[PDB]
Structures are given as C-alpha cells and as structure tokens.
C-alpha cells in the first residue's frame, strides 16, 4: 500500500486502537478535499486508505483524531488532533508510512518514504 | 504573554531562527482566520503574539513554516509545515514547542499558571 | 520474539540500517553483564536477540550505537549512543518492542509491551 | 552555566518538578564517576551543576530519575531512568532537554555559543 498510518500510545505502551484518521488532498482551488478515511486496527495500523492509481501527486493532509482517542480513555488532552501535511509523489510514486506517537500534551510524528 | 512558541533544530542542535509562525483562530463559519504571526528570534522563540484580552477561549492553530526553514539550509524535508491545533481554556500561559527534523517533528505544550 | 529493536533515521526518512545494538542485564553484584547483541537489518529491525527461556526477569539496558551510525553518514552527532533501561518480565513474560527515532542532536524512544 | 538540564512532563503538560538528576564523568579506568547532581526546580530546570573550569572535555552521562517521578504520581512507567551520554567538546553552553511520558521519552541537546 502506498499510504499507511501507524499510531502508538506513549501512556500505555501499546498501539493506539480505533483512532480515526482522515486524509485530505489540496484541490485546484487550493481548498482541502476529502481523500480517504479509516480507523486504526488492534495493531495501531491503518492500511488500505488508497491505491497507487488514485494517490497521484499532490499536497496531502493526514488528520489523526487524537482528542477523541484520549477522551475515551479518561484524558482531556491538549491537541484537537495531529496533522501531517506533505507533498506526495512529486518525483514519481512512493510508499509512505506516517507514524505518530501520542501523549496527552505532546506528539511525535515521523515519515518513512520508500521507493518501490 | 499568554502564548509563546519555541522552535528547535535537531539536525544542528540549535534554536531554529527566523522561522515564520502563523496563528489562526476558528471563525463562526468554522473557517480559519489569521490571528497573529511573526518569526522566531535568535533563541528560537516568538513572544508577543497576543494579549490576555484578545486570546479568548476558542480553537486555535499554530502553523510553523518548516519547509522554508529546511530549504534555506539546503536540506530536503518531508512536511509542508508543522501544525498545532488546540483549544484555549480559561479553566494561564501556553508554551508550544516544536523540535524539528527533516522527516519528523515533535511538539509539546506546557500549560502553566502564573 | 520477546525482544525486538527498531531504529529509524529522521534525517533521511528511512530505516536506520546496520546500527549496532548491545543489550546488557544487571548481575547479582549490580554490574552490567553482556546479554546479547546484533545489528539492524535493511528494515531497521533487529530480531532474534534472545529467547523466552533466556530472557528472565531483570533490569536490562539496550544500548543503540547511534554515534557510529551518524559518523558513517558524514554527521558528527551529539550523543555517544541511545540508552534504554527497563525492568523486564517482573509480572511474567512479556514481549517488548523498543523503537528509537534518531536525529543528530535528538532521539526519541518508545516501548510497546504486549502480553502473549 | 556550561550545562543546564530541563525536564518536561507530557502527561500533564508541565515542567517535571523535583526530578533527581545525576551527572557522571568517565574516569581513566573507563568507569562512570559522580560529577554533579540536583533536583529540577518548579520550572523543570536544573542550573548550577558545574562551572566552566570544571567541565573539561570528556564523556559525560546525565541520568534523569524518571521512574521515581512517575511512581510519585501513581503512574506505571517503563524506564528505570533516562540516560543522555555525550562528549563535551571545546570546539559553549549545553542544554539537555527531556520530554517524559510513561513509555517514551524524547531528548534534545541545544549547543549554543555565548
């Protein structure tokens, strides 16, 4: 898969399960248009968001819905969500893994980009 | 100073100097509208963005212009910018820090009571 | 495997390949004794360090040799290595994944602990 | 102040207060020996560990006693402590920061010239 999202919970030391993820792409009029969405699995991973055909060059935003995640665990966190905004596929198709490590008042995000 | 932003560079072990930072507030039509902006100083900090009177409860976004910072250094980065989106709550000082690398960033909020 | 180490390079956006990892365990005289070692693969992962039988309760240190990694890429980094020190298996056997995200003047480390 | 240590708590969004910090230097027999120590202040910082005269080039270790910090808050942590090992080089001020969570930490070094 050309786009995978992995989310981990730094309070529990576990995958962050059932985290909602929304992906948008910038349109020709420079607005964000819905591109794909899903929820992380028991492994903290979200696969199957898109295909190589559909994932053309563009500016993408991966929105990870961290506030809803934390609230369900009894934590009122600082952020509304974690946002990851990047140009994709501007040098040809790549595979992207976006990882996010979550705490209530912090997060870290890292991308691994590979050429298939 | 109810809101301060600090940006650090994890490639060079330094403050991230002259980084543009833009703050937005959510308007009634649920759109983002410009609220304040500036560039980080030689210590990587940006003070004086807003005042207590102006910084009312609401949802804000801080957008740190990391791509241009890395381009100026000749380093290829992943992200267009870093985004920190949060609600201000009167329930008193917010420090938003961001630690920047070319393909990763970490952001932390310190919320303290004067 | 009960102990796995994963290392990523935040400058390149890639797995950190051929990173040396040394694991130690505290001995009865409170000194660090060699426990296992290896190098990360092309995926940034190091498997096969130990077995469930050998990985008894104890205090362990995973030493990730980050300075040698960076120097080979032309970077003189800040740290000598990244150290991860933890009690393991004190509530019965667990599986541990230790991840480290590396930059020249920073690193992040996260553990995922699961019960098999 | 050639060496400062700052510790932050990512669960509460605050400085990490009253955290014990121990600094070691490598001795000639390649063993670690105590060099300096203290506890972080209400701002999460620890100043005054050493002096310019004393902080000569060499390999140092900073060990932040995170387990006891989390135990006092009633939170189960992963690590015994956080360790930052580095060489001091005369090639001038070191700030070591650590952002703490129960199963993760991030550490950053800012090296600046006065």
Numbering used by the authors:
A (entry chain A), C (entry chain A): 10 to 125
B (entry chain B), D (entry chain B): 10 to 100, 103 to 125
Cite, word for word, the article reporting this structure.
To test this, the dimer–dimer interface was stabilized with the well-characterized T119M mutation by generating the double mutants R34G/T119M- and K35T/T119M-TTRs. We took profit of the fact that R34G/T119M- and K35T/T119M-TTR double mutants do not aggregate significantly at acidic pH to solve their crystal structures at pH 5.5 at 1.5 and 1.4 Å resolutions, respectively. As expected, no major structural differences between the pathogenic mutants and T119M-TTR were observed, with overall Root Mean Square Deviation (RMSD) values for the Cα of 0.24 Å for R34G/T119M-TTR and 0.15 Å for K35T/T119M-TTR. On the other hand, in good agreement with the molecular simulations, the BC-loop regions (residues 36–40) were remarkably affected in the double mutants, in one or both asymmetrical chains. Indeed, putty-style cartoon representations based on mean Cα β-factors show much greater values in these regions, pointing them as the most dynamic in K35T/T119M and R34G/T119M TTR. The contact region at the tetrameric interface of double mutants, which consists of hydrophobic interactions between the AB- (residues 18–28) and the GH loop (residues 105–122), was preserved. The presence of Met119 keeps all those interaction residues virtually at the same positions, which allow the formation of key contacts in the presence of the second amyloidogenic mutation. Gdm.HCl-induced equilibrium denaturation revealed that the double mutants exhibited lower stabilities relative to T119M-TTR, all displaying a single transition, with midpoints Cm= 4.3 M for T119M, Cm = 2.6 M for R34G/T119M, and Cm = 3.2 M for K35T/T119M. Although the crystallographic structures of the double mutant variants were very similar to that of T119M-TTR at the same pH, greater flexibility of the BC-loop (higher Cα β-factors) was observed in the presence of the K35T and, especially, the R34G mutations. Overall, the crystallographic data suggest that BC-loop fluctuations constitute the triggering mechanism for R34G and R35T tetramer dissociation and subsequent aggregation.
